[PDB]
Amino acid sequence: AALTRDPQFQKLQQWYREHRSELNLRRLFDANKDRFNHFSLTLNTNHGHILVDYSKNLVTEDVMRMLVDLAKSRGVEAARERMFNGEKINYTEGRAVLHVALRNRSNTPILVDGKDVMPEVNKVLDKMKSFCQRVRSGDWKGYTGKTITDVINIGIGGSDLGPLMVTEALKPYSSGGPRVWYVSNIDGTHIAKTLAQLNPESSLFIIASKTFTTQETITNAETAKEWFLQAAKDPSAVAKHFVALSTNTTKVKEFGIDPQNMFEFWDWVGGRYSLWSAIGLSIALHVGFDNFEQLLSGAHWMDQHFRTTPLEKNAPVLLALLGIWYINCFGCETHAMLPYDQYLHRFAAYFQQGDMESNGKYITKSGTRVDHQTGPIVWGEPGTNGQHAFYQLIHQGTKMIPCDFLIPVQTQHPIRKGLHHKILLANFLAQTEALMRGKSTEEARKELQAAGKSPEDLERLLPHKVFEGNRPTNSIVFTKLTPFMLGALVAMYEHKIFVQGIIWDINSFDQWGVELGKQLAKKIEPELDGSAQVTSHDASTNGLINFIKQQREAR
Amino acid sequence: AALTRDPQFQKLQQWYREHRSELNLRRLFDANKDRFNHFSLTLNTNHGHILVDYSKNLVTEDVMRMLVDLAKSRGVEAARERMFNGEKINYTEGRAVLHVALRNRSNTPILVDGKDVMPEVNKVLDKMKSFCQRVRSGDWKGYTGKTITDVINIGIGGSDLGPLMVTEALKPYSSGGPRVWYVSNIDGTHIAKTLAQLNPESSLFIIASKTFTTQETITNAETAKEWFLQAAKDPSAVAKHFVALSTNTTKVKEFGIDPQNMFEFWDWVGGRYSLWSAIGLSIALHVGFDNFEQLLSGAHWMDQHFRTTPLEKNAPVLLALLGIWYINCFGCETHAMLPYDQYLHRFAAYFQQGDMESNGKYITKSGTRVDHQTGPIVWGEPGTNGQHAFYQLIHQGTKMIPCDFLIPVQTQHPIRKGLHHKILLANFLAQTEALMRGKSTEEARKELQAAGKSPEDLERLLPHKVFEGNRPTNSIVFTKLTPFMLGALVAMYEHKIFVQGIIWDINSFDQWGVELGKQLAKKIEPELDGSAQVTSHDASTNGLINFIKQQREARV
């Protein structure tokens, strides 16, 4: 595979083999009072600052130089320029990759097949702006003349997670917007418990699907339409309550949707990179189009940082390189994302798709199987909740787990004269400090002596109180979680994922790994009907089906 | 460490090194038509069946025999008896471990320090039952005479995740109950956005904390009380709107809650095993005490299954042992929990605490450091949501990831004549089938040719379309997700976690690993006040603090 043959990767591996044991964070900070200055970035966006503090990582200046040289050798800059120039870097599908065009606020031309995409991007943005104004102002009325109070996004995967994450994160910016709901699961619970809380006269459904043929989304859409028509009766009323994020005019019109309420996007918009497109309509309806434009502007700011900053000071690049170090040298399977912000409670889940569906790959550009690890398992929960759930294992288990800790300096809810946010910040800071410093046997012994423990009780408890430390983290601190700053943060991680994929020589922008499950599910569906025993699969699948059929009519 | 020195563990390791390359699931199923019958367990709880199908695991009869021999050699059954008998198996804290007493519907005595705990367990349950009836019927009035419409649980960790997971999972059973809200984060967003939606006249706050000193919970509770008194003014109205769940009668009274409003629990109830106790009050208020009693009864059934079933047929033991195989022989860091049930959307998050805080440990009972892996990282989202987020990596990444797939046969919402649930079931079945079978080069090439790909295009795309398969799963299928069945399933995983901890020789029931972060936060808190530079820590902590102080003033 390309990475394993790269001379700069081999140099990194040799250094790791020879020097792993000198990487102790306590000793590194004790020997370099300037370590924070050397291993951190501060970004002024003009709409808030971002501090990316990567100094609590198991790195030295030589490691960082070797990592930057790996990015150079692996062609990160040339690949970045191909993306931004509209070249077909999604090579298995033969497609451009242009989520950066969706937020290209400068309107500099970006050509695909010799034709600028920016007029089409802006035409859809203009359509979104108009529609948002009409819905939010009460100009758009339902079939009985009432204004829209609830917007229901129906979609799966990329059509769901991004809009949900963003409307959750930007909830304070939604005064004057309708409530938003997200239905994604095919499990009938999801639509059924949603519809039970809604009034058909005042509900607007957004059906998010390029093809308008996606099974789960279209089944949910058909269930919603049947519920709506049970109240409204008139098929012509559907066009007041259903819009589409799609390009299938024929199917959208067949569904009962006015084709002037189809909001288009393009094949170079990957679903897991799509919240910046028409797929973000529910964001713009909830927080307003002006705030949606701020979100796009933040992403655009970070796109420029990624383009113009030397690799050695380029935030997405450094985040990516640190991840390569832990994955391909230390062997860490996972990466935890730990935002100390309840509004960001769905941020880790969003990057589960963005990161894992992008880089959970094993075939390289040349068709050759990787002989190294690729993308990690991403997971996490907001702090301080996660601190009371699973940090026991991060501190005192047997796993090395790189963690990104994120927090805004300024809270959206400065209640109690700032007391809650003060405590939140103190925990944010203390947890990374604790992971780095640990607590030695001698330190824990002193504490036990002071508590008045007998010699026997002390020796018995002492090892359990030791924290080995040396557990690395990134801390990402930003002035305030505004629409613009959220866009910059999401884009930062998008480009991190991109850089990692280039280094691994995989395609971050396809997803062939989803096909086999879809094919097998289509074969099983018809076999579940009827009482006949199924014998057409392996013995486990058959046994499971036959148990399902037996238990179907158990009271 | 004990596990590493165990001869049965060594035999398991030796077999793995010699035979690992022969474990291919296609070939195993092709060679043994009875594989599903030999590698599955059916339980009839009398309140639904549970099929634990472990046949899509990289195991043979000999592996399972060696694993059961390991459980015997590590003393699993004797340790189980110590737990059920009230012995102080939480040995670093000198405590009994008796969540099984909280749901002991049989009322057989369980002694701690020579006294049966069941009378006090049942006294608190009776108090819960009477309180729930009064609140739900409207007999309990707020300070202006109105009935309670909203119950707000304030707690974090073990005082939050269980009650939240269960009330989410049992939402169909909450007709006639008040709305429930969970406030847990110290982040002021959490309480602020909740209080903005509530009327003080009709809201009941439940302050849940084992010691009643958790900083987050008491701060949130004080903020709620301040908001409530801004409307009510009169301090005696607090007794109509605030109750406590705790072990610390003194700290609850110091907070100013009426002693008759305290629902007690005990030191031998771990927080992450506490939903079965007074901590479950918000469950009982939302779905009714009768449904809470069914939840307890389900757990009690599974406790008895775990206690009375020979190891080779014992569901939590087998799940535990399959996990040991993947963790200590294959080296898998993680365990994915994938319920195909939207109501179970917080089940994996609950077992992040239950599993990782229990078994994320590194010191053994003798004080020796482990020289082997312990607890895995648990993660997951419900199907089919997770399927469209991260299954790409499970199918075609570079990681081996044991997955538990769970589903009820019968849906709570059989809409469209069962169409949605038919599709959900088909995906549940197809995903584990796909993970097992994969798709070979030869098979993928045939598909590309039939689709009419040119030779150039076929050869370019072909490797990307291959699925290596051999990815193991458990499938756990149960009749319906009722209160009883949820109780049984949660207890099953509690006992899995217990068995693994005994095998690893660690204490599943302490949590000394949370102390250092708490101590360091208490030191940083006063340093954040005022404008002075901080220089007292390592350079990173100092630099982060100083950036916070700089940007605290910034006008965006």
Domain boundary at B293, B322, B340, which? B293
Same domain, B257 and B372: no
Place of tokens 């269980």: B162
Which chain B residue shows the shortest CA-CA distance from A509?
B392
Q: Is A253 annotated as a binding residue?
A: no
Residue B445 near chain A (CB below 8 Å)? no
Compare CB distances from B465 to A425, A512, A551 and report the shortest one's residue. A512
Q: Is A246 annotated as a binding residue?
A: no
Task: Name every residue whose Cβ is closer than 8 Å to that of residue B69 and which is 6 or more positions away in sequence.
Answer: B8, B11
Out of B388, B422, B446, B523, the active site residue is B388
Domain containing residue A544 = 515-555
Q: Is A210 annotated as a binding residue?
A: yes
CA distance B36 to chain A (A): 5
Which chain A residue shows the shortest CA-CA distance from B420?
A188
Q: Is B158 annotated as a binding residue?
A: yes
Question: Looking at this protein, which amino acid is placed at residue A263?
Answer: F
Same domain, A190 and A298: no
Q: Interhelix angle for B61-73 vs B7-19, to 10°?
A: 160
Neighbours of B129 (CB within 10 A): 16
Enumerate the residues of chain A whose CB falls inside 8 A of the CB of residue B190. Answer: 342
Preferred mutation among A358, A429, A439, A550 to probe B, highest tally of B CBs within 10 A: A429
Tokens of residue A407, six digits: 């927090």
Distance from C-alpha of B32 to C-alpha of A172, rounded to nearest angstrom: 59
3-class secondary structure for B438-495?
Answer: CECHHHHHHHHHHCCCCHHHHHHHHHHHCECCCCCEEEEEEEECCHHHHHHHHHHHHH
Distance from C-alpha of B347 to C-alpha of B336, rounded to nearest angstrom: 11
B201 is catalytic: no
Residue B541 near chain A (CB below 8 Å)? yes
Domain boundary at B259, B293, B327, which? B293
Are A28 and A96 spatial neighbours (Cβ–Cβ below 8 Å)?
Answer: no
CA angle B282, B288, B291 (to 5 degrees): 105
Question: For the domain that residue A230 is a member of, what is the CATH number?
Answer: 3.40.50.10490
Distance from C-alpha of A497 to C-alpha of A358, rounded to nearest angstrom: 7
Distance from C-alpha of A162 to C-alpha of A276, rounded to nearest angstrom: 9
Residue B164 near chain A (CB below 8 Å)? no
| 3-class secondary-structure state, position B142 | coil
Q: Interhelix angle for A7-19 vs A61-73, to 10°?
A: 160
Are A340 and B373 spatial neighbours (Cβ–Cβ below 8 Å)?
Answer: no
Domain boundary at B270, B293, B316, which? B293
Same domain, A117 and A256: yes
Are B348 and B379 spatial neighbours (Cβ–Cβ below 8 Å)?
Answer: yes
Same domain, A488 and A533: no
Preferred mutation among A187, A523, A555 to probe B, highest tally of B CBs within 10 A: A187
Distance from C-alpha of A228 to C-alpha of A232, rounded to nearest angstrom: 6
CA-closest candidate to residue A319, choices A78, A503, A75 = A503
Distance from C-alpha of B5 to C-alpha of B12, rounded to nearest angstrom: 12
Adjacent-strand bridge partners of A363: A369
Residue A201 near chain B (CB below 8 Å)? no
Enumerate the residues of chain B whose CB falls inside 8 A of the CB of residue A390. Answer: 352-353, 356-357, 360, 377-378
Same domain, B300 and B445: yes
Residue A92 near chain B (CB below 8 Å)? yes
CA B534 to chain centre: 39
CA A228 to chain centre: 33
Q: Is A33 annotated as a binding residue?
A: no
Enumerate the residues of chain B whose CB falls inside 8 A of the CB of residue A387. Answer: 514, 517
Preferred mutation among A45, A46, A185 to probe B, highest tally of B CBs within 10 A: A185
Distance from C-alpha of A532 to C-alpha of A534, rounded to nearest angstrom: 6
Same domain, B333 and B415: yes
Q: Is A309 annotated as a binding residue?
A: no
**B 354-393 near A (Cβ less than 8 A):** 356-357, 359-363, 367-370, 372-379, 381-385, 387-393
Q: Is A213 annotated as a binding residue?
A: yes
Out of B38, B518, B522, B523, the active site residue is B518
Are B98 and B112 spatial neighbours (Cβ–Cβ below 8 Å)?
Answer: yes
CA distance B495 to chain A (A): 18
**A 458-497 near B (Cβ less than 8 A):** 459-468, 475, 477, 479-480, 482
Distance from C-alpha of A141 to C-alpha of A138, rounded to nearest angstrom: 7
Which chain A residue shows the shortest CA-CA distance from B374?
A398
Same domain, A163 and A188: yes
Buried b (16+ CB within 10 A) or exposed e, B478-516: bbbbbbbbbbbbbbbbbbbbbbbbbbbbbbbbbbbbbbb
Out of B201, B216, B357, B494, the active site residue is B357
Q: How was this structure determined?
A: X-ray
Contact between chains at B414 and A188 (C-beta distance less than 8 A):
yes
Distance from C-alpha of B66 to C-alpha of B64, rounded to nearest angstrom: 5
Are B220 and A385 spatial neighbours (Cβ–Cβ below 8 Å)?
Answer: no
**A 104-133 near B (Cβ less than 8 A):** none
Preferred mutation among B59, B541, B542 to probe A, highest tally of A CBs within 10 A: B541
Enumerate the residues of chain B whose CB falls inside 8 A of the CB of residue A514. Answer: 387-388, 391-392, 395
Cis peptide bond N-terminal to B42, omega within 30: no
Same domain, B504 and B532: no
Neighbours of B27 (CB within 10 A): 11
From the number of C-beta atoms within 10 Å of its C-beta (0-12, 13-18, 19+), residue A285 rates as: buried
Residue A38 near chain B (CB below 8 Å)? no
Neighbours of A137 (CB within 10 A): 10
Compare CB distances from A40 to B36, B395, B543 and report the shortest one's residue. B543
CA distance B227 to chain A (A): 10
Same domain, B376 and B277: no
Write down how long chain B is.
Answer: 556
Same domain, B140 and B205: yes
Residue B215 near chain A (CB below 8 Å)? yes
Distance from C-alpha of B208 to C-alpha of B155, rounded to nearest angstrom: 5
Distance from C-alpha of B323 to C-alpha of B313, rounded to nearest angstrom: 16
Contact between chains at B393 and A377 (C-beta distance less than 8 A):
yes
Residue B34 near chain A (CB below 8 Å)? yes
Same domain, A123 and A218: yes
Q: Which residues of A are catalytic?
A: 357, 388, 518
Distance from C-alpha of A389 to C-alpha of B39, rounded to nearest angstrom: 33
Measured between alpha carbons, how far apart are the two ends of chain A, in Å? 56
CA distance B360 to chain A (A): 4
Same domain, B285 and B309: no
Are B479 and B408 spatial neighbours (Cβ–Cβ below 8 Å)?
Answer: yes
Enumerate the residues of chain A whose CB falls inside 8 A of the CB of residue B409. Answer: 547-548, 551-552, 554
CA-closest candidate to residue A355, choices A378, A371, A373 = A378
In chain B, what is the greatest distance between 2 CA atoms, to the nearest angstrom?
A: 83
Residue B331 near chain A (CB below 8 Å)? no
**A 270-299 near B (Cβ less than 8 A):** none
CA A453 to chain centre: 48
Q: Is A22 annotated as a binding residue?
A: no
Q: What are the Cα distances from residue A501, in Å, to A82, A103, A305, A309, A505?
A: 14, 22, 19, 19, 6
Q: Is A547 annotated as a binding residue?
A: no
Number of domains in chain A: 3
Question: For the domain that residue A540 is a member of, what is the CATH number?
Answer: 1.10.1390.10
Distance from C-alpha of A38 to C-alpha of B177, rounded to nearest angstrom: 57
CA angle B194, B199, B201 (to 5 degrees): 135
Compare CB distances from A389 to B353, B388, B525 and report the shortest one's residue. B353
CA distance A99 to chain B (A): 18
Enumerate the residues of chain A whose CB falls inside 8 A of the CB of residue B367. Answer: 459-460, 462-464
Contact between chains at A523 and B430 (C-beta distance less than 8 A):
yes
Tokens of residue B267, six digits: 């030191």
Compare CB distances from A55 to B333, B432, B540 and report the shortest one's residue. B540
CA-closest candidate to residue B212, choices B279, B277, B282 = B279
